[PDB]
Amino acid sequence: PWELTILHTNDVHSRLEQTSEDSSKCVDASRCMGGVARLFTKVQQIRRAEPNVLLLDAGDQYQGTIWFTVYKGAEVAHFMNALRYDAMALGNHEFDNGVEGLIEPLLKEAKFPILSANISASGPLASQISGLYLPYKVLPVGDEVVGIVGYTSKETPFLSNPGTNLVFEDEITALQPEVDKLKTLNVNKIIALGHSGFEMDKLIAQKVRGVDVVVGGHSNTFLYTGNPPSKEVPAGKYPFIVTSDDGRKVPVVQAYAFGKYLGYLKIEFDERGNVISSHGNPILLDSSIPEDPSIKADINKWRIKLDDYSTQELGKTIVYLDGSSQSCRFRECNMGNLICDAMINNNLRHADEMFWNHVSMCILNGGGIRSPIDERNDGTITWENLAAVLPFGGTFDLVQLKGSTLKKAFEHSVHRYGQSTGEFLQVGGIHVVYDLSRKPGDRVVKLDVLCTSCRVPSYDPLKMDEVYKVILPNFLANGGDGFQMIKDELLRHDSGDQDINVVSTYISKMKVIYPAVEGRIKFS
Amino acid sequence: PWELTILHTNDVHSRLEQTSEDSSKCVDASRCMGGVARLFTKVQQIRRAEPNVLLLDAGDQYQGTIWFTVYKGAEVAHFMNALRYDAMALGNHEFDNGVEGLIEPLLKEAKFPILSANISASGPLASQISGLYLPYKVLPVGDEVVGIVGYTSKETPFLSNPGTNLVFEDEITALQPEVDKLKTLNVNKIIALGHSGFEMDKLIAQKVRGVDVVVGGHSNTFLYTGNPPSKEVPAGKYPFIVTSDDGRKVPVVQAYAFGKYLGYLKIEFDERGNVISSHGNPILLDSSIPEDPSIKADINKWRIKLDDYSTQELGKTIVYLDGSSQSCRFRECNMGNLICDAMINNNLRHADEMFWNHVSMCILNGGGIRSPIDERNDGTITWENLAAVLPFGGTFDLVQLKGSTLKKAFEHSVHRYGQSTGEFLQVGGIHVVYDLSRKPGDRVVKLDVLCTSCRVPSYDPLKMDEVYKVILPNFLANGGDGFQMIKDELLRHDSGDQDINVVSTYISKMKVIYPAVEGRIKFS
Ligand SMILES: Cn1c(=O)c2c(ncn2C)n(C)c1=O
Ligand SMILES: Cn1c(=O)c2c(ncn2C)n(C)c1=O
Ligand SMILES: [Ca+2]
Ligand SMILES: [Ca+2]
Ligand SMILES: [Zn+2]
Ligand SMILES: [Zn+2]
Ligand SMILES: [Zn+2]
Ligand SMILES: [Zn+2]
């Protein structure tokens, strides 16, 4: 039997430095985790011991911290080249800075193949991009070869900025002929590496004949066999075994997100490329593993430009930005209006004749707004100021919610009004009226929402059975601040851009901001 | 007696081409008026007949048509140099593109002195601008000399974009020492040429000892002795005689606006520089005066770049821009919200610790919105599209109104609701609720306005005795669409920027717009 070691990361999301336990800023180094210097140590160790090793990334290196804001992907090419990745699949966030911000910094600078079989271009762009990403690569491994076929979320146009040329094809439809073609070229060991989420990974394992292993991403899925090593709760065993339509057992793996874990799967193949066995587990990259000193020194050198950037002017405000708890946990506050407006602006994507924009609505718990910004520093706003308001290193995500769920959320928002609790909601594209003289649970007396399926945006009553797209913190999509109804009832959830980066982009674009308190939230 | 002919223009406001009777676009050439080609004919004629002639401009050449949008003052330097102006005073609108847009195109390219005695600079800007404008110029005229002393509205920081360095001093305080100094240099014939408005011109005539003639602007004041030649109603005789504190008679002149008239004042002086007599009248520049063929040919050549600019993309909309009468004369319409938002953005000026901005409020009669803009031309908006919405060539002006006046205006807005009349108001920084079941005159049941004297903008009830700044069309400041209460009751009125230019600037800055109907106007 020929034994392959697959080492894999996904959704690293700009966690170049070691992080806290919850993948925010590292404060107590003896409890910090991940980062590329520690990943380098562990990959180097495994490559010393195991003969046949591939190091794979299933996409979404782009987006998540100030590293991406400043270096725009040059950090990804540099540090992935230093760790000697063997292949990467394109994720949705690789399109955040458009095609041009993918071609230049990543596709031209990576020393490893970048893959996606389900993205096609036309016109001049097809000539410009030809060969800079590939459907698959056949890689030598010891005295064998392994085919790696890539795939990217078909939902990328809703979740990033790929532009109107590129077309994202159904993953299974695009993959099967490429896997068919590898079989005709005598490549009998095939890894599908891609970025569509755990549910689609299982469907690919089931339906794409000839795929031996699926290495995925997007859904930040944690799989584990045994007692979990940290706080993440497993969605299933590692690997997750799918019974294929061709009647094989196909292992499916993912490794959470944020560089906290290194996926590690050992596959035994027979002489005909059939998987005889598969076993492994993700490795927690905790402080017991030292940071490679050379990578850490390069990381500290690259940090200098980040520190310099963090105190530069992004834009100006001519208004005080009231992010005080006394405002934002009790009533409409202008800092909440600013952040929700920035969240909606971040989610303007290219539209059908069917909507002016696919999403119009935002909610933000006042518990998430942690500072005001004073306008009397010559109106200057810096990144450092925004990091005081939004200190948790979260994302602003897209969810689909029934109107009944969202009405429940607005009831939760005031269920114990008066105590300075964090669940009080700041909004965009939503007008709510409360009557606090009613029983908890029955205090929302008006709730109107901004249409999407309309050429002129206007407000309509919320409908209980209708499914709304909403931009909201990752923290609330995960039921934070008591919003269990959101976690339990949401129909779709895709992670979005870093919270600070959303607001800093909007302020940069606007140049001069003056958000008002304007009646989005009233009390009767 | 030594006889001087003063020819003078003021508030020409980018009317390089001949205009209609009401100073909008020329449609029936046999009834058109003004423009620099006709002004050239008439000035040339007078210079052939009269020995001692000065051609003076009292400021506000900048701003008013697409000529300024595209050429940014290069057209002013070019055509004023062709007509051989002898001197110009700085107006407020000369600061519309900041100091840099005054230095370069006008102060560096004018072949005639540019004057203002009441503007001072400090730091590097004082070195950069030194001598490029002057307090006064002594000009040879035949075998005599005439001193010309300049002045500019002290209110320029509220009415344009001069920046935070320049300081606008009280006109009379700044002028007297300069006039004193000319007396010490044996210059006994002194013209005050400046841009502060008719009321301040009369105060200067009264109080600045040694001034013999005041040639002013800003207030678009029409003076006439006799039957008026056109539709403009005189504010007083030409010249308007002020009895000075030193007990002389001092003539004060102005010549309306828009290049429609050439001011013409004949002054007889005695050997000691005392005015013995003054007489004249503005000359209507009507079609009986031919356009100089050489200037007209240069005008037609420069127009090519205007026609080219007018079809270029300014920005995009992802929403239909509903400027239909069926919407904007009956309810809140998103095109009205766009234009009011653009009007408020145009009026962001540099602020004290005392306000976030000096003005927060806008009203726009639906009668002034004349077209929608379809978003299905790839979202493109051009100047030509905006000219369909705003076809009258007006300005968006700043007025001060008591809250009682503005409540009267909102009652007028719905006094005969239901007939598709133009007075129905679109708004910004104002939330109004009507109850149409009440008697005409008593239908406004809520009227809340955006604070200025506040660090966080929020809405408060309108107060009847408080004076509000409002941005609104020139047409309404003049009582158009039945708003007689605005014309009769306003406490201050300064003309602002061209209507189309305000909206095109905002769209350019924003890049992508998506104005909503959001509850600024409701019905109970
Ligand atoms: C209140 N709150 C938290 O307490 C929090 C968080 N992310 C992590 N934590 C712990 N966010 C975004 C938040 O709003
Ligand atoms: C309705 N209306 C007019 O009729 C008009 C005008 N300017 C001139 N006229 C005639 N404006 C701006 C306007 O709103
Ligand atoms: Ca196989
Ligand atoms: Ca005199
Ligand atoms: Zn991701
Ligand atoms: Zn993803
Ligand atoms: Zn003017
Ligand atoms: Zn003026």
Curated annotation (Swiss-Prot), chains A, B:
Alphabetically ordered keywords of this record: Cell membrane, Disease variant, Disulfide bond, Glycoprotein, GPI-anchor, Hydrolase, Lipoprotein, Membrane, Metal-binding, Nucleotide-binding, Signal, Zinc
Glycosylation sites recorded in the entry for this protein: 28, 286, 308, 378
GO cellular component terms, semicolon-separated: cell surface; cytosol; external side of plasma membrane; extracellular exosome; membrane; nucleoplasm; plasma membrane
Binding of AMP, residues: 329, 365, 370, 392, 475, 481
Main localization, broad class: membrane
Pfam families found in the cross-reference section: 5_nucleotid_C (PF02872), Metallophos (PF00149)
Lipid addition sites, GPI-anchor amidated serine: 524
Site residues by UniProt (Transition state stabilizer): 93, 96
Binding locations of Zn(2+) 2: 11, 60, 92, 195, 218
Gene Ontology molecular function terms on file: 5'-deoxynucleotidase activity; 5'-nucleotidase activity; GMP 5'-nucleotidase activity; identical protein binding; IMP 5'-nucleotidase activity; nucleotide binding; thymidylate 5'-phosphatase activity; zinc ion binding
Binding residue positions for Zn(2+) 1: 11, 13, 60
Enzyme Commission no: 3.1.3.35, 3.1.3.5, 3.1.3.89, 3.1.3.91
Superkingdom assignment: Eukaryota
Bilayer topology: Lipid-anchor; GPI-anchor
Disulphide bond pairs: 26-32, 328-333, 340-362, 451-454
Cell compartment(s), UniProt: Cell membrane
GO biological process, one term: ATP metabolic process
Class of enzymatic activity (EC top level): hydrolase
Residues that bind IMP: 329, 365, 370, 392, 475, 481
Subunit structure, as described in the record: Homodimer.
Disease: Calcification of joints and arteries: A condition characterized by adult-onset calcification of the lower extremity arteries, including the iliac, femoral and tibial arteries, and hand and foot capsule joints. Age of onset has been reported as early as the second decade of life, usually involving intense joint pain or calcification in the hands.
Function: Catalyzes the hydrolysis of nucleotide monophosphates, releasing inorganic phosphate and the corresponding nucleoside, with AMP being the preferred substrate. Shows a preference for ribonucleotide monophosphates over their equivalent deoxyribose forms. Other substrates include IMP, UMP, GMP, CMP, dAMP, dCMP, dTMP, NAD and NMN.
Family note: Belongs to the 5'-nucleotidase family.
Protein name in UniProt: 5'-nucleotidase
Organism per entry: Homo sapiens (Human)
Highest classification ranks of the organism: Eukaryota, Metazoa, Chordata, Craniata, Vertebrata
Protein encoded by which gene: NT5E
